[PDB]
């Protein structure tokens, strides 16, 4: 991250070994479960591009996925270079990605007036690449999810919303899915109870009713 | 491109 | 949380990986035991809305429960928008929930004069949603709890008060429950001893007597 | 509503 | 606890997750062994009432015992309200217990001139309730403790003083107990050696002699 | 009383 | 690393035992997997030459590899002495390696105006020696990697890019490899699908197609 | 310990839970091995009497030993009251032991001009009591230690000096012991080699020779 | 170590329990493997003599070795008293060893103008004693090391250089050893390959060739 | 005496 | 000598 | 050379 030094100037704070080891543990154990993106985003709060790159280089495994992430940063940084032509100097996509930008340039922009938040901009590109990885590591679309004939409705809801979280679909599609597929793919008894609640029932009401099956 | 296939992240070009 | 920077201004403190990993451990192991709410509240001391949201996004599992929590934040933030019409600017419900509010707006309100404590306000809504989850994750009402025919009275008390903690009922109902059901549902011998103490006996007296059975 | 079903918490709208 | 902020004013320090997790571990594993009271008192050094309450709420288990602790804080805070009638304002018992007192009122009193140490006062009430719990969780009075016919005298001493620590009796009774019961309840050979030392022997002398049996 | 049976510690009254 | 002291001067910060123990764990467990170089580089952020040397001396095992690293620092420091003839004084190769340079000379250069970053210069030589070790600890060239007849294409990609990371070849060779060998060495069905995509397909497209086999 | 507060005054630092848990681990596992005294002394660097008392109260087990430690602090504090009659005020033995002295009096004396180091004085009394415990927990005097007929001389030396460390005897007796008993109680072959070295041989020489047996 | 206090003066920093526990773990597990000396030297960065002594006293085990270390500090401190006759005052050998020097005298010298670095001087004597221990704990001289008839050459190199690290011999002898014994004691096939490289081959070349056997 | 048998260490007297 | 056989390290003499 | 075979890293020469 960045901090004020005791000399009264903005200076880099290096990543703690506990933060790097946490990120290793996260990526090793959770293997791009969707929770890895908020976990990454928490571990990389205030990160400069060099800090982000040090996290990504440390992963070691999953190199096919890390290449899909590099393909994403390629096209996102090219899109930045397209949307922001060249005239501190303004950062190019390779500056935001931390390749052509020194650490001191990164801190310079992140503390400019107004700031250019190259750490956050690059972190958006990484998070978007992790999103593509997370879909392709999901085994099932939400359309595949159906309640087991004796599966508790709370466990089916947990499967459904955990899948819906990985989906992709635009937000109004996720509204239609949580209204419609959640009912449509229940077991016949719970399905009948849900339809008896009417279409506007909240998840709390739906669970409270179908717990009785 | 900004990152090439075999390279680490944050590799300076050339 | 929020801290004074060495430059002499109020600035964000990022969540430590140990606090996030603690929250993950808590929610993974304790699965909304009622203790999860004070544990959450301790881990989120001084939290901005972005800090709270980072904790909740990190949970990963229990997605049916996390949706019940989002249903709660929906209705609570709508109730805020109802109780506080629009005229720093005043926060809307989506500002307090940290969706339409930048981190700098959150710190601005949390350090205003007088402050508007958007972190604490939102934390109340989250804690209320966790309360709804905690009831629905409780398997039994206090009315279901009866002492086993040879169960030690201290163990029955522990079952009873652990259930009463999850109840819901208003405080005067919890008074009536701890006076009446606690006696009424004891084993016949301990039940007889308790009635022989009279109705006003303290829990210490009740335990000290019924330990003799 | 302030948080929609599939979205993360703290997701900015639109 | 409380600390000086970098702005030059007294401000709350939140409880670390390691302190809360330590307190959970302590109460989960040690289940009100008498050592839990000094351990609690060390973990709650400089604690405000809100800090103490966050520790107690986090316990989760042992709810019958935590109710006996609430019965104690009830009568102790009522006794405070009796001994200190109402006229910063002076704290009522519900202020010291942290229910009717904001955190800022707690810090106000804890940094007043002279201070009113509402954190320490409340911590005395909690420690007294934990003392009542500790006796009732002790299975045996000191009068029950007798040396096994081939038990090493050092192990009998360890059993005796560990029980005497939980006792309750006033200090001059504990003097009489360590002079009299310690001899009276030894095995016949060690008992004879101890009586041969005379009544004033120190524990070091007693152990050094009875090690020869 | 200052703390009632079912309540958490530090629960504000009413 | 280096920090500002409270006296207002640049002063050494000693390596934490957690950083040294982390480096020991890394080198003991990961045995010069290519990830060890970014992991080393993160653990040695802002390191003086004495700091780097303390990390390398602590390794203990792998002494044949640590000698190959000393052979590398020999030739790199000799090349420095060749490229930078002698005229603070300018550092010789033995100064940058931390042998003939005191810690105070190292901090002097690292805080000079302009700085001479002897810590970073030496860290480049160490990282280059670790690169030679990493190739020789790799068992296979990328040319050896072929997809198993029923191996999932995602697992073959992971093997391929993990090997390509250790390669050595210049960047345009790695481009040719990821375009050509990745297709050429797939299983016959996936190989046919890949050729049906055309030569410019991205790794995401390639995986998405060959997942259907 | 004691620290300078940010307000510019000397103020208590509370014991960390890691230091208390370390002390618990030490006393639980090592059970007054002689190493427990330097370990205690390191953990209690700069400790006030209240800090020391919090460490000792936390022990929980070994209560017969902790009573022998209280017998020692009784006689040592009485000896202080004898050597230092009464005239800040001067501390009595009960002030140094932290019973009649507030924490603020303890810090007052520990920061007086000249200081009265009541923390260190009391820590001497505790360390002396721990010494009495350590002898009585040692099973053997140095006179009992003899080399096993095929025991390696390095292992006999380790047994001998580990016992000599617990001894008690005055320093010139420990000189005579390490010169004389170390030879006298070796196995006959090593014993013959040692006598062939002459009486002034150093432990390095003795080991280097007797390694050949 | 030593630090600047917030009052603006040089003051002791006590050893963390994690540093002491790390040193215990190191000496308990690694039992004077040569890596223990750099590990000790890292853990004791900036250590005063009292700090070093607290580390050494904490070891507990290996007391025969710790006596060989005391024999070394005896002769080294006597040699200091010989090389530096008596005239702040100048430190005697017993001052540098921290026996006759208070902590305040140690910090006085370590912050004098020019400083006398009694911490570093004493740490040299300890490191020299640890060197004598490390040789005597090594089971084999480098002359004993021969490649197993089917042992991989990389594993023989690792055995050889790990032994050479413990040797003792002066640096030009270690040059002759790594040139000559490394070849001379290889298996006959690898030995033939090495001789076919010529005498000046680097370890990288030697390994790269003999990997083909 | 300064510490009596059953008491904790640092117990204030009376 | 500066450290005698049985003594701890840093033991003050006499 | 700057580091010789048996020596630790950072060993001062001579």
Automatic annotation (TrEMBL), chains A, C, E, G, H, I:
GO CC annotations on file: host cell nucleus; host cell plasma membrane; host multivesicular body; viral nucleocapsid; virion membrane
Gene Ontology BP annotations: viral translational frameshifting
Name of the protein described by the UniProt record: Gag polyprotein
Record keywords, A-Z: ATP-binding, Capsid protein, Host cell membrane, Host cytoplasm, Host endosome, Host membrane, Host nucleus, Host-virus interaction, Lipoprotein, Membrane, Metal-binding, Myristate, Nucleotide-binding, Phosphoprotein, Repeat, RNA-binding, Viral nucleoprotein, Viral release from host cell, Virion, Zinc, Zinc-finger
Residues engaged in binding ATP: 18
Keyword Transmembrane helix attributed: no
Localization per Swiss-Prot or TrEMBL: Host cell membrane; Host endosome, Host multivesicular body; Virion membrane; Virion
Organism: Human immunodeficiency virus type 1
GO molecular-function terms, A-Z: ATP binding; RNA binding; structural molecule activity; zinc ion binding
S-S bridge residues: 190-210
Membrane topology annotation: Lipid-anchor
Lineage top rank: taxon: Viruses
């Amino acid at each position: 991250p960045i901090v004020q030094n005791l000399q009264g100037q903005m200076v880099h704070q290096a990543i703690s070994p506990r933060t790097l080891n946490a990120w290793v543990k996260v990526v090793e154990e959770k293997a791009f479960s969707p929770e890895v993106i908020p976990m990454f985003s928490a571990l990389s709060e205030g990160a400069t591009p060099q800090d982000l790159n040090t996290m990504l280089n440390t992963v070691g495994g999953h190199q096919a996925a890390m290449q899909m992430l590099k393909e994403t940063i390629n096209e996102e940084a090219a899109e930045w270079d397209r949307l922001h032509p060249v005239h501190m100097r303004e950062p190019r996509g390779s500056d935001i990605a931390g390749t052509t930008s020194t650490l001191q340039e990164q801190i310079g922009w992140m503390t400019h007036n107004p700031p250019i938040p190259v750490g956050e901009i690059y972190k958006r590109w990484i998070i978007l690449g992790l999103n593509k990885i997370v879909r392709m590591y999901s085994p099932t679309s939400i359309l595949d999810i159906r309640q087991g004939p004796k599966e508790p409705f709370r466990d089916y809801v947990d499967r459904f919303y955990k899948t819906l979280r990985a989906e992709q679909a635009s937000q109004e599609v996720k509204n239609w899915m949580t209204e419609t597929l959640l009912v449509q793919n229940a077991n016949p008894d719970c399905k009948t109870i849900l339809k008896a609640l009417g279409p506007g029932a909240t998840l709390e009401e739906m669970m409270t009713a179908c717990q009785g099956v | 491109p900004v990152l090439f296939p075999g390279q680490p992240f944050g590799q300076p070009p050339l």
